[PDB]
Amino acid sequence: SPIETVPVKLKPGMDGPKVKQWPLTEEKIKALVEICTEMEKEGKISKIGPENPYNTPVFAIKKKTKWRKLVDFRELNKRTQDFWEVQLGIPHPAGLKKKKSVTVLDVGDAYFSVPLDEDFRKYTAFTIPSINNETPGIRYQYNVLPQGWKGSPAIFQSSMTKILEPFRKQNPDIVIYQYMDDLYVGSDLEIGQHRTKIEELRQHLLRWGLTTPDKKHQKEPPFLWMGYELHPDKWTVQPIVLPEKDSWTVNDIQKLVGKLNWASQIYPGIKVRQLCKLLRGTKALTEVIPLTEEAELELAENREILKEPVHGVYYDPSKDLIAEIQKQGQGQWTYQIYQEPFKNLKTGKYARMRGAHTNDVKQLTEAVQKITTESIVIWGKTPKFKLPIQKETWETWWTEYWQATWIPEWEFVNTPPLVKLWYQLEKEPIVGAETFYVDGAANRETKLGKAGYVTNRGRQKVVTLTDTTNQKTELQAIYLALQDSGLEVNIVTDSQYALGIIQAQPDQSESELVNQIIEQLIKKEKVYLAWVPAH
Amino acid sequence: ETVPVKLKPGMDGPKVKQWPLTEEKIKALVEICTEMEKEGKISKIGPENPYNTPVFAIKDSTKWRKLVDFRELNKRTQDFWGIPHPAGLKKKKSVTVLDVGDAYFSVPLDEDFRKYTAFTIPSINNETPGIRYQYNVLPQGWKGSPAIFQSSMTKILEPFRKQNPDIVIYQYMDDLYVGSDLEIGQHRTKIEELRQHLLRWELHPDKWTVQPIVLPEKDSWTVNDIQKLVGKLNWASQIYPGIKVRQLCKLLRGTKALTEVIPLTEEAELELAENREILKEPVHGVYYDPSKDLIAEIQKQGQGQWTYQIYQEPFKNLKTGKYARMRGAHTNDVKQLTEAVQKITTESIVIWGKTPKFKLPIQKETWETWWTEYWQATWIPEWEFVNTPPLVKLWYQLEKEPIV
Ligand SMILES: CC(C)c1c(OC#CC2CC2)c2cc(F)ccc2[nH]c1=O
């Protein structure tokens, strides 16, 4: 090829590889000899000699049955400089525009079609062994991008970009996507028009040394892309298959849970509670755990759900972008982004984020932000939101929370259950309501404590606890206060953590205790918590 | 010509990842870049360049402006030991800021340093390779820039500094703060006089009052009232050790209704008066240390209100203040915040000539997803995300506000 090479250097003052050539048989050698004489002429490699101290181990494998070759650059690579990341962020189906026609050119010997930085070449040197360590073996080096070498992919795609700059400009109404060795080409032109242009493109590549065929290996829609089958008009989800057996190992159960978990995003209703259950106290990946009835059941409900065809639409820039969210239980949320009703671009759910202590509004908030970021990426725009929370709820919460928070343009949609505040600590002491002066004290070392209260009304109590901690007592104090009082209470404490609840008013925590206190808080009609300095 | 700039001993170029940008943000950046490309200020680069710095587009204007986050690069850029801070800037009736950022494109950047200025324009849904470029000229947002361009800068300025020696001119990054005691008209007429001058190639510091802490007063006090008072004062004692809550805390002996009224003993009443006296002025012995990081903490007070303190040592504040949302930010915390951050940082610059390190009462994800949409300053301070201690807020919420 006549494409300008990319200047490549080795990592900080290191040196090219000098690993010794693995010994092979007269058979594997004669093969590598054959292959290499070809590459030698195709221009991919060059016979070198004793001027070179570098070397990489060449191997000989038969694929599915002619003798092929494999060079191991593990070393060369770990010595090769760093390059700017290669597409780690790939497109996501729901971000594609629909097209009249879409073609996928399979750029052949991509790598070996691009010139290697002549300077660097020397390091790629390798050697074909002699019949059981005889006289010197055959010596070569690469003159093009080597299959398996660190800098290749990164260098190849650039080359592909430089080479498409003209055509692209010249064909605005034509959109290409480079990925690995494939070129995805779509357009809204007429099928013949398309065909013509494709061929014009195809030829354009050749003008630089890019073989890309047609006729034999030629790919044909739909197109497989990370779990989806893509059609120009729409996309559909690769139907997922759950094997039926009478012997399930741990390995089996985890991988299964894995595939199910992936299915949860697209498919509605997938559950694995009982499946996960089977992993409890497993002693070995190969262990055979019998599925309980419950497991055998859901495993069955999932097989049925997964035999449903989930198809989708592509992004239309001229239509609104909408996202609706559902709170499927505590800490679990489902969302689906669409433009025209029921024709979803994408869907998905967020696992029950078991935090130390939050509330549903906050959690709703987070789901909103995760989505927003996703969208910004997929569509470079953010959706108008449809949220199961009254605008009044929102306003009340947010406008008083100690932490900065927000929700882009959104609208209420009443699709129960709605998210709400489970309680609200009073703003001012409750006149009338009983006042409980609480206190918990525990020996952190002996883990022995007590907790109790004394109300202005004369009521009192104390409890002794074993295997506890100070914070726990403090909380248990508050717990009993809530337990023993009417629907309206005043509780004063010197607990710094209670000062936290006051500021965040959490409706879920990591601690069962805090949890319990919550359940109580939720139960009173009015509660006013007051913190006072200890001692 | 080009001066040989380098990185601090053994430091490597940034390699920060580009954050996702909006469609409108990208479209403008591409436009902006193709021009600069043509104009020779920047040049596309290869994959052999592994560095990267974030970029984004900001807007007072409606044309979009390009903004690069050189925070990492700057920190790694060698030092040049610029302009000593003019203690007088703070004492001016009115200051105006100007963006002399455009002046740098003029000077070339040491060829061997360019690679480190690499930045990338993303593509929606990653359907296109990012557009890699690197600088050929002095980059806006880089520290090395105002420096290298100092000689040229001062040079051009003198003629004005002399025609107007009552005016103060300070340069931070791409900005220029002009401070004079003239009256609004005569001031802004004199600034435009300065703009004009610059082209051929509204703060009010003296009003920033130090605000005190006012303790509530009442006809009658309740168990709760006193309790709240004691809590604040006790905390507050971490600043003024003279503050005392012994007499008061005595009134708190007994299991009585929070709502009950307690009569204040004269002992207690003195104690309170004694405390009001203490809080009547900033704590002594607090001085700014130039060889110490400047810190700014912010608390969300609610109803659109925010409080802050700029200090270097815990409880030894250099300045404290409040911030009320600006018309329009009504339903957006993030806007108020970024707006707030920008404000404080300018005062910071204006006073000590350096940006503080922030502690923001917001979650990292939330901030990072939206702060850019409301950013307007050419610079970008450093920040950390925190949880506001319930008391720190309560104390400063107590600050004094005008009569009317
Ligand atoms: C040119 C690119 C961005 C493009 C497509 O190529 C592609 C691709 C990678 C799989 C994502 C594409 C492919 C389809 F199968 C359907 C719609 C499409 N719409 C498009 O705009």
Report DSSP letters for B315-343, one per residue: TEEEEEEEEE--TT-TT-HHHHHHHHHHH
H or E segment and range at residue B350 = helix B333-352
Residue A156 DSSP symbol: H
Question: Are B88-104+146-202 and B203-288 in the same CATH fold?
Answer: yes
Query: To which CATH superfamily is domain B88-104+146-202 assigned?
Result: Reverse transcriptase/Diguanylate cyclase domain (3.30.70.270)
Contact A209, A1 (CB under 8 A): yes
User: What is the Cα–Cα distance from B103 to B85, expressed in whole angstroms?
Assistant: 22
User: What is the Cα–Cα distance from A341 to B152, expressed in whole angstroms?
Assistant: 61
- In chain A, what residues touch B124 (CB-CB under 8 Å)? 95, 377-380
Contact A372, A410 (CB under 8 A): no
Which one of A90, A370, A530 has the shortest CB-CB distance to B126? A90
Torsion of CA B326, B327, B328, B330, to 10 degrees: 70
Counting from 1 in the atom list of ligand 1, the atom nearest the Cα of A179 is 9
Closest CA relative to residue A491, chosen from A517, A466, A469 = A517
Method: X-ray
Query: Could you give the angle at the alpha carbon of A323 between the alpha carbons of A317 and A325, nearest 5°?
Result: 170
Q: Which residue of chain B is at minimal alpha-carbon distance from A504?
A: B390
Estimate to the nearest angstrom the gap between the alpha carbon of A62 and the chain centroid: 36
User: Ligand 1: distance of its center to the CA of A225 in Å?
Assistant: 10
Estimate to the nearest angstrom the gap between the alpha carbon of A75 and the chain centroid: 30
Residues 6+ apart with CB under 8 A from A403: B300, B361, B362, B363, B387, B388
- In chain A, what residues touch B260 (CB-CB under 8 Å)? 456
Contact B371, B338 (CB under 8 A): yes
Which one of A177, A406, A492 has the shortest CB-CB distance to B333? A406
Q: Which residue has the tokens 């199961």?
A: A388
Contact A149, A124 (CB under 8 A): yes
CATH of domain A1-86+112-152: 3.10.10.10
Q: What are the residue boundaries of the structural domains of chain A, listed by start?
A: 1-86+112-152, 87-111+153-221, 222-315, 316-422, 423-534
- How many CA atoms lie less than 13 Å away from A356 in the CB half-sphere? 4
Q: Which residue of chain A is at minimal alpha-carbon distance from B260?
A: A431
Q: What is the 3-state secondary structure (H, E, C) of A257-281?
A: HHHHHHHHHHCCCCCCHHHHHCCCC
Beta-carbon separation of B20 and A399 below 8 A? no
User: Any bridge partners for residue B163, and if so which?
Assistant: none
Beta-carbon separation of B126 and A91 below 8 A? yes
Beta-carbon separation of A499 and B390 below 8 A? yes
User: What is the Cα–Cα distance from A191 to A388, expressed in whole angstroms?
Assistant: 45
Which one of B132, B234, B363 has the shortest CB-CB distance to A403? B363
Q: In chain B, how many H helices and how many E strands?
A: 11, 15
Contact A427, A502 (CB under 8 A): no
Counting from 1 in the atom list of ligand 1, the atom nearest the Cα of A185 is 1
User: Ligand 1: distance of its center to the CA of A345 in Å?
Assistant: 14
Beta-carbon separation of B365 and A366 below 8 A? yes
User: Ligand 1: distance of its center to the CA of A316 in Å?
Assistant: 13
Closest CA relative to residue B375, chosen from B137, B138, B71, B57 = B57
Contact A453, A468 (CB under 8 A): no
Shortest distance, CA B401 to any CA of chain A (angstroms) = 21
Q: Which of A155, A374, A376 to mutate to test the interface with B (most CBs of B within 10 A)?
A: A376
Segments in B149-300 forming alpha helices (H): 150-163, 184-199, 223-236, 246-251, 266-278
Contact B397, B307 (CB under 8 A): yes
User: Ligand 1: distance of its center to the CA of A323 in Å?
Assistant: 22
Estimate to the nearest angstrom the gap between the alpha carbon of A450 and the chain centroid: 47
User: What is the Cα–Cα distance from B385 to B367, expressed in whole angstroms?
Assistant: 9
Beta-carbon separation of A6 and B361 below 8 A? no
Q: What are the residue boundaries of the structural domains of chain B, listed by start?
A: 1-84+105-145, 88-104+146-202, 203-288, 289-395
Question: What's the token pair of residue B190?
Answer: 């004199």
Strands (E), A362-459: 384-387, 410-412, 434-443, 448-455
Q: Which residues line ligand 1 (CB under 6 A)?
A: A 91, 96-99, 102, 175-177, 184, 186, 223, 225, 230, 232, 314; B 127
A173 marked among binding-site residues: no
Shortest distance, CA B86 to any CA of chain A (angstroms) = 35
Task: Give residues 292 to 331 of B whose Cβ lies within 8 Å of A.
Answer: 299-300, 302-303
3-state DSSP assignment of residue A22 = coil
What CATH class does A87-111+153-221 carry?
alpha beta
Contact B7, B117 (CB under 8 A): no
User: What is the Cα–Cα distance from A373 to B370, expressed in whole angstroms?
Assistant: 10
Shortest distance, CA B106 to any CA of chain A (angstroms) = 29
User: Ligand 1: distance of its center to the CA of B227 in Å?
Assistant: 66
What architecture is the A222-315 domain classified under in CATH? 2-Layer Sandwich (3.30)
CATH of domain A316-422: 3.30.70.270
User: What is the Cα–Cα distance from B156 to B165, expressed in whole angstroms?
Assistant: 15
Contact B118, B132 (CB under 8 A): yes
A525 marked among binding-site residues: no
Which one of B26, B128, B361 has the shortest CB-CB distance to A402? B361
Task: Give residues 170 to 199 of B whose Cβ lies within 8 Å of A.
Answer: none
Shortest distance, CA B389 to any CA of chain A (angstroms) = 8
Largest CA distance in chain A: 104
User: What is the Cα–Cα distance from A117 to A4, expressed in whole angstroms?
Assistant: 9
Shortest distance, CA A504 to any CA of chain B (angstroms) = 10
Q: Which residues of B143-174 are buried (b: 16+ CB within 10 A; e: fewer)?
A: bbbbbbbeeebeebbeebeeebeebbbbbbbb
Using the Cβ of B52 and the Cβ atoms of chain A, whether some distance falls under 8 Å is answered with yes
Q: In chain A, how many H helices and how many E strands?
A: 13, 23
Residue type at B291 in one-letter notation:
S
Chain A with chain B: Cβ pairs closer than 8 A: 164
CATH of B1-84+105-145, one of 3.10.10.10, 3.30.70.20, 1.20.1560.10, 2.40.50.140: 3.10.10.10
Beta-carbon separation of A532 and B230 below 8 A? yes
Residue type at B231 in one-letter notation:
G
Is B289-395 CATH 3.30.70.270?
yes
Strands (E), A64-168: 70-71, 101-106, 126-128, 138-140
Residues 6+ apart with CB under 8 A from B194: B98, B160, B178
A252 marked among binding-site residues: no
Closest CA relative to residue B124, chosen from B25, B5, B53 = B25
Task: Give residues 107 to 126 of B whose Cβ lies within 8 Å of A.
Answer: 118, 124-126
Q: Which of B26, B119, B127 to mutate to test the interface with A (most CBs of A within 10 A)?
A: B127
Torsion of CA A23, A24, A25, A30, to 10 degrees: -130
User: What is the Cα–Cα distance from A386 to A54, expressed in whole angstroms?
Assistant: 63
User: What is the Cα–Cα distance from A321 to A336, expressed in whole angstroms?
Assistant: 11
Contact A506, A498 (CB under 8 A): no
Counting from 1 in the atom list of ligand 1, the atom nearest the Cα of A93 is 11
Estimate to the nearest angstrom the gap between the alpha carbon of B128 and the chain centroid: 36
Beta-carbon separation of B362 and A405 below 8 A? yes
**A384-387 and A410-412 beta bridge pairing:** parallel
Residue A13 DSSP symbol: T
Question: Are A87-111+153-221 and A316-422 in the same CATH fold?
Answer: yes
Counting from 1 in the atom list of ligand 1, the atom nearest the Cα of A230 is 15
Counting from 1 in the atom list of ligand 1, the atom nearest the Cα of A104 is 6
Measured by CA distance, the residue closest to atom 6 of ligand 1 is: A184
Q: Is A263 left (phi over 0), alpha (psi -120 to 50) or beta?
A: alpha
Phi first, then psi: what are they for B229, rounded to 5°? -55, -55
Closest CA relative to residue B133, chosen from B123, B144, B152, B120 = B120
Question: What's the token pair of residue B114?
Answer: 């360019």
Task: Give residues 153 to 172 of A whose Cβ lies within 8 Å of B.
Answer: 154-155, 157-158, 161
User: What is the Cα–Cα distance from A175 to B285, expressed in whole angstroms?
Assistant: 67
Residue type at A128 in one-letter notation:
I
Angstrom CA distances, B345 to A238, B308, B309, stand at 53, 12, 12
Angstrom CA distances, A458 to A435, A455, B236, B238, B262, stand at 10, 5, 34, 36, 19
> How many CB atoms lie under 10 A from the CB of residue A495?
25
What CATH class does A423-534 carry?
alpha beta
Q: What is the 3-state secondary structure (H, E, C) of A196-224?
A: HHHHHHHHHHHCCCCCCCCCCCCCCCCEE
Closest CA relative to residue A66, chosen from A33, A31, A42, A38 = A31
Query: To which CATH superfamily is domain B203-288 assigned?
Result: Reverse transcriptase/Diguanylate cyclase domain (3.30.70.270)
Shortest distance, CA A288 to any CA of chain B (angstroms) = 43
Residues 6+ apart with CB under 8 A from A411: A384, A385, A386, A387
Contact B217, B225 (CB under 8 A): no
Q: Which residue of chain B is at minimal alpha-carbon distance from A498?
A: B390
Q: Out of A174, A183, A184, give the residue to mutate to test ligand 1, the one with the largest number of ligand atoms within 8 Å of its CB.
A: A184
Measured by CA distance, the residue closest to atom 7 of ligand 1 is: A184
DSSP string, B16-35: PPPPP--HHHHHHHHHHHHH
Counting from 1 in the atom list of ligand 1, the atom nearest the Cα of B125 is 3
Task: Give residues 432 to 461 of A whose Cβ lies within 8 Å of B.
Answer: 435, 437, 454-456
Q: Which residue of chain B is at minimal alpha-carbon distance from A185?
A: B127
Residue type at A480 in one-letter notation:
L
Using the Cβ of B397 and the Cβ atoms of chain A, whether some distance falls under 8 Å is answered with no
Query: What's the alpha-carbon Rg for chain A, to the nearest Å?
Result: 33
Beta-carbon separation of B393 and A157 below 8 A? no
